[PDB]
Amino acid sequence: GSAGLQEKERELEDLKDAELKRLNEERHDHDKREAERKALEDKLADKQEHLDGALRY
Numbered sequence: 317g318s319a320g321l322q323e324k325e326r327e328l329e330d331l332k333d334a335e336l337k338r339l340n341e342e343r344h345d346h347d348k349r350e351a352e353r354k355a356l357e358d359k360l361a362d363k364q365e366h367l368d369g370a371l372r373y
Contacts, residue, residue, distance in 0.1 A: 317324075
């Protein structure tokens with residue numbers, strides 16, 4: 317693998333660095349936390365399921 321024979325290049329390292337920054341931010345972690353809080357509230361209360369709406373008019 318020399319003279320650019322391999323598809324991998326310097327930009328490869330840069331890509332990995334970007335991933336590290338994203339992980340550090342932990343932005344997705346916050347989203348999961350919010351979802352958990354929503355479940356606790358159970359405002360929708362759509363957890364309960366029965367029949368098929370036949371009972372309801």
